[PDB]
Amino acid sequence: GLPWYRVHTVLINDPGRLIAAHLMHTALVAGWAGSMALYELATFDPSDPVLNPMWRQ
Amino acid sequence: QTLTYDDIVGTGLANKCPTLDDTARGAYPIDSSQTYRIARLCLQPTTFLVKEEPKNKRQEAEFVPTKLVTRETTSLDQIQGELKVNSDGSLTFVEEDGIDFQPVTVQMAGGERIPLLFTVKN
Ligand code: CLA
Ligand code: CLA
Ligand code: CLA
Ligand code: CLA
Ligand SMILES: CCCCCCCCCCCCCCCC(=O)OC[C@H](COP(=O)(O)OC[C@@H](O)CO)OC(=O)CCCCCCCCCCCCCCC
Ligand SMILES: CC1=C(/C=C/C(C)=C/C=C/C(C)=C/C=C/C=C(C)/C=C/C=C(C)/C=C/C2=C(C)CCCC2(C)C)C(C)(C)CCC1
Ligand SMILES: CC1=C(/C=C/C(C)=C/C=C/C(C)=C/C=C/C=C(C)/C=C/C=C(C)/C=C/C2=C(C)CCCC2(C)C)C(C)(C)CCC1
């Protein structure tokens, strides 16, 4: 059948499943942005914007 | 017109110091030979400020505002003691007894709880 590097080509003539795949991608990216923001907030020390700003951390 | 416990209970008014009408801009003559007394001193804190600790030695060590987290438990009330007229007509208040402390916890920006024993003991 399909080699490994072509598995997603089953979406080429399936617009509803392409939209589904694209929604799942957007879900993952949005989930990344939330989880990343929360990991940063858990780690960020906001007490010294002068010698310990966000770019040092 | 003067409230009872059933009017006061649960309203938060029990944590308030009593007030005076705006008309009371008077003066209380202290006779320098009489003995006076404080029958009730009430302190109602409205603001708690906490000094920050800059790790620098320097910087502006400013008092920052905090949020109270231990609710309307903050006032000192029913404090009594002698008010001794001195030689020079200065009055000194010597605290004797009353509800003269309250543990208070405030919280700073970031979530640091700061407990303090808010007091006027002795
Ligand atoms: C945005 C990402 C994304 C989306 C929307 C799709 C969508 C699709 N894949 Mg593809 N795929 C992906 C990424 C994606 N894939 C990746 C990264 C791989 C390599 C592992 C594959 C390998 C692959 C194969 C071999 C096949 C598909 C197939 C398909 C189709 C059916 C669903 C399926 O069987 O997937 C399979 C689902 C996965 C492979 C999920 C990957 C799981 C990873 C490890 C994440 C797990 C989450 C976990 C909780 C996080 C772990 C964190 C870690 C630090 C511990 C669908 C069109 C099938 C198809 O229709 O082919 C004709 C199929 O046979 N995919
Ligand atoms: C918008 C970006 C985009 C999209 C939608 C596609 C879509 C596609 N590519 Mg293309 N491609 C792209 C960018 C993109 N590509 C880029 C940037 C490159 C250079 C790296 C390529 C090089 C490329 C080749 C050489 C081939 C394709 C193929 C394909 C088709 C099948 C993919 C598949 O089944 O892989 C399945 C993939 C896996 C099962 C695993 C791959 C795992 C990678 C190597 C590492 C893990 C990735 C990680 C999970 C996510 C990182 C995301 C990143 C952006 C941060 C599908 C139409 C194939 C094709 O044309 O079929 C006829 C094919 O042969 N692509
Ligand atoms: C005028 C109508 C219209 C509107 C508003 C859009 C809008 C969009 N389409 Mg497009 N599209 C249209 C007509 C339209 N399309 C037509 C007529 C076709 C041919 C069938 C397509 C074919 C098409 C394909 C194949 C794909 C898109 C995709 C997209 C989205 C990319 C941005 C995104 O995902 O943001 C992120 C989302 C948000 C910030 C929240 C979304 C807010 C929306 C409006 C809420 C949706 C509620 C609504 C009731 C549900 C259906 C909406 C639908 C009209 C889009 C965006 C929602 C892509 C997609 O779906 O990506 C996942 C995609 O793959 N479109
Ligand atoms: C502009 C932004 C952008 C673009 C164009 C893409 C494009 C893509 N992403 Mg998405 N992604 C993005 C932002 C973006 N991403 C962000 C901000 C996040 C959150 C971190 C993700 C998280 C994400 C996940 C979890 C997945 C994707 C996947 C994909 C691919 C889906 C199509 C496919 O089948 O390719 C076929 C694959 C390729 C053509 C390979 C692309 C290789 C890229 C360019 C980097 C090379 C990676 C290298 C081999 C290994 C890296 C280290 C490793 C340890 C991970 C496509 C290349 C999916 C995918 O790759 O499925 C197989 C997938 O699973 N992305
Ligand atoms: C968030 C999720 C993250 C999950 C990510 C998962 C990552 C997926 C891993 C993909 C690995 C793919 C490897 C496929 C391997 C494999 O399938 O190869 C064989 C394959 C040939 O496939 P054909 O087209 O013949 O089809 C046969 C089919 O059965 C394939 O499905 O060719 C390719 O894949 C091209 C790339 C060759 C790449 C391999 C080259 C080997 C060179 C060895 C180098 C080492 C020695 C160096 C010494 C100096
Ligand atoms: C369902 C639901 C929900 C929930 C949601 C959730 C909870 C989500 C989450 C999600 C998430 C939380 C997600 C996340 C994601 C992540 C990701 C997507 C990531 C990725 C990554 C990557 C891709 C990486 C890679 C790499 C490495 C590792 C190294 C270097 C290189 C690179 C960068 C490539 C709710 C309740 C709302 C509602 C509705 C239903
Ligand atoms: C309707 C319904 C339901 C629902 C369900 C759902 C819809 C779910 C989903 C779920 C999901 C949706 C899940 C998800 C998951 C995710 C994950 C698992 C992720 C992970 C991630 C990670 C791993 C992270 C990492 C990181 C990053 C990315 C950045 C920063 C750093 C860190 C490390 C944090 C139920 C059954 C309940 C019930 C019945 C009904």
Side-chain angles (χ1 to χ4, degrees), chain A residues 16-52:
Chain A
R17 295 208 162 166
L18 185 63
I19 293 168
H22 283 175
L23 279 165
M24 184 61 53
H25 185 267
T26 310
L28 288 156
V29 178
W32 178 82
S35 80
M36 195 72 248
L38 291 176
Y39 173 87
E40 291 195 10
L41 291 179
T43 55
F44 180 50
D45 182 2
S47 64
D48 189 12
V50 187
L51 304 183
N52 199 19

Side-chain angles (χ1 to χ4, degrees), chain B residues 10-117:
Chain B
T11 66
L13 303 185
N15 196 40
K16 304 292 190 53
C17 102
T19 68
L20 305 177
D21 37 58
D22 194 55
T23 62
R25 47 165 44 246
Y28 192 71
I30 302 286
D31 200 320
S32 189
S33 51
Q34 199 151 186
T35 41
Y36 291 103
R37 176 147 198 89
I38 310 268
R40 180 194 177 186
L41 170 64
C42 188
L43 275 69
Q44 174 201 336
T46 71
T47 303
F48 293 89
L49 301 163
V50 184
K51 216 180 212 173
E52 39 176 297
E53 32 110 82
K55 280 153 207 67
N56 201 73
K57 172 62 58 181
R58 227 107 342 161
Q59 219 188 265
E60 279 111 35
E62 305 167 349
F63 283 92
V64 300
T66 49
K67 283 155 159 193
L68 176 78
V69 302
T70 53
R71 311 182 62 188
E72 303 305 316
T73 49
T74 50
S75 294
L76 320 179
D77 204 356
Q78 298 178 75
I79 289 160
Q80 299 180 50
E82 57 204 298
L83 180 77
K84 312 175 61 244
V85 192
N86 303 126
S87 56
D88 49 3
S90 58
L91 316 150
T92 179
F93 165 67
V94 177
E95 206 254 350
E96 197 205 20
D97 191 47
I99 304 157
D100 66 348
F101 69 98
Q102 294 289 152
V104 178
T105 299
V106 287
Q107 191 169 297
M108 309 226 299
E112 187 181 10
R113 272 80 178 273
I114 302 296
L116 61 137
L117 185 79

Side-chain angles (χ1 to χ4, degrees), chain A residues 4-9 12:
Chain A
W4 71 267
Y5 51 86
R6 293 185 197 164
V7 299
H8 296 164
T9 54
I12 294 179

